Ligand SMILES: COc1cc2nccc(Oc3c(F)cc(NC(=O)c4cnccc4OC)cc3F)c2cc1OCCO
């Protein structure tokens with residue numbers, strides 16, 4: 102494991118990071134109880150207790166990329182901004198838990214019904230199209246909040262959208278932004294915009310493109326984007342002006358919005374504020 | 389790679405499939421298909437009886453995951469049908485990739501065989517080769533095995549000119565995060581092109597194309613249609629045209645396979661019955 106000398110941090114930084122830190126004594130991880138595994142890593146069940154209060158059911162995950170002392174300080178400063186994020190459609194972290202055993206941990210509020218993609222894909226779950234459009238709105242409202250804070254997600258998808266106990270879609274981040282700037286690599290090319298594939302420039306406009314793909318997933322009940330196209334022919338596909346086709350049970354107004362998101366020029370794409378109003382309309386009209 | 393790293397109940401349960409390195413000679417000098425079908429070499433499998441067996445060995449260099457591979461080994465090993473290429477065993481080692489071993493199929497793949505201009509099989513032979521595949525897929529279908537990549541290229545011929553349905557196991561590759569192979573889009577079913585979901589009914593669609601390959605002596609499907617515009621083409625209702633030497637009854641079976649509604653497509657048991665009648669109405 103990675104033995105980090107946690108006493109090497111700047112006292113001023115440490116004192117400015119007191120609200121975001123946890124302290125291993127306050128946080129209980131369940132290494133036996135694995136809730137999921139994927140590209141980023143394993144996620145575990147957790148038990149935090151705030152202000153010597155009741156047990157808070159949370160999800161814990163490690164960041165193995167963080168090795169040296171510098172990479173810790175990097176993430177702590179980022180965590181300050183992440184903690185300040187307060188929105189009903191954004192899954193903000195509770196805090197970071199440093200330890201001398203291995204790499205740092207990040208604690209987030211536990212999400213009962215899990216990720217958005219597996220939810221709609223699940224056979225037992227059978228939500229109507231009314232709900233599927235509703236999920237898209239929450240992401241947009243969620244992304245609108247982040248957009249106002251000048252946040253660039255760089256990996257917006259159904260998989261990175263989580264349902265709580267009240268089936269509330271919250272935008273989650275797995276730190277793709279970090280990995281890119283560290284190692285410069287496996288990137289989500291199908292969710293990436295035409296700029297991102299070539300230039301690797303990421304903005305709100307690239308997230309709008311990614312949001313377009315997210316809407317496609319919802320309407321197809323979590324189908325893999327570009328399912329009749331190779332992963333390494335996506336650049337050519339988009340260069341030739343071909344986009345995703347209209348799903349079977351997808352309103353024309355909603356698909357029209359998807360096409361706006363998938364505009365070759367970046368500035369021509371709509372803002373997240375606009376997507377809230379449009380999808381709100383489509384949510385109301387639909388039977 | 390450590391061959392006994394994870395759960396040690398597998399190795400006990402998967403004794404039959406696993407084969408010892410001592411009882412397997414790999415002729416690395418003799419290479420099959422001139423390296424067009426990956427790293428496939430000749431081999432000699434020492435049976436516990438005594439006498440040796442001519443086999444073909446392939447190195448699978450797409451593995452770190454390992455659990456999922458051996459799981460399929462149990463399923464593959466416990467297959468046995470005249471028109472299905474059986475898996476002899478997998479040879480694990482302390483170092484190197486896993487080696488899959490199969491019985492040597494003399495005349496190679498079916499696609500190149502019918503295309504081979506030197507060979508001149510009659511239409512009855514071609515319908516004969518098509519029927520064998522249906523009987524092979526009937527067996528696999530009955531044991532709930534979705535082939536996914538069913539095509540002439542994935543069918544093999546022995547010295548008795550017996551068609552065997554072979555699996556290369558590349559269908560388990562189809563990724564979220566990629567770093568800068570081909571999907572069989574022209575063999576894929578309509579719903580498979582939209583969902584990437586494969587069933588026995590999706591294999592029926594692919595089988596329809598396989599028949600079309602046979603009847604055209606291994607022509608390229610949809611030769612004047614783009615890879616990208618292949619889904620729309622099928623949604624428009626367009627299908628492969630009737631080959632020159634394709635009988636009308638056999639072409640109906642092809643169209644029957646390419647029904648947009650998947651449930652409406654015929655089973656492999658149903659297809660065998662149809663083609664048996666067609667095969668028996670030919671002189672030879
Ligand atoms: C059981 O359902 C699930 C419920 C879940 N509930 C809450 C959280 C989950 O996973 C996450 C996680 F552990 C970490 C992070 N964030 C980061 O790592 C991160 C890294 N760097 C910078 C900033 C970062 O964010 C602050 C995001 C997650 F969403 C869940 C996963 C589930 O499983 C999904 C698959 O089954």
Ligand SMILES: COc1cc2nccc(Oc3c(F)cc(NC(=O)c4cnccc4OC)cc3F)c2cc1OCCO
Pocket residue numbers: 420421425428444445446448464473475488490491492493494495496497500544554555556557558
């Ligand atoms: C000389 O003739 C030939 C004779 C041949 N005899 C036997 C096998 C051949 O090719 C195959 C091969 F090497 C590997 C596999 N199986 C797998 O890879 C696999 C991988 N993962 C999981 C499961 C898997 O299956 C169990 C299947 C094949 F059919 C032959 C090819 C020839 O040439 C073809 C061109 O003519």
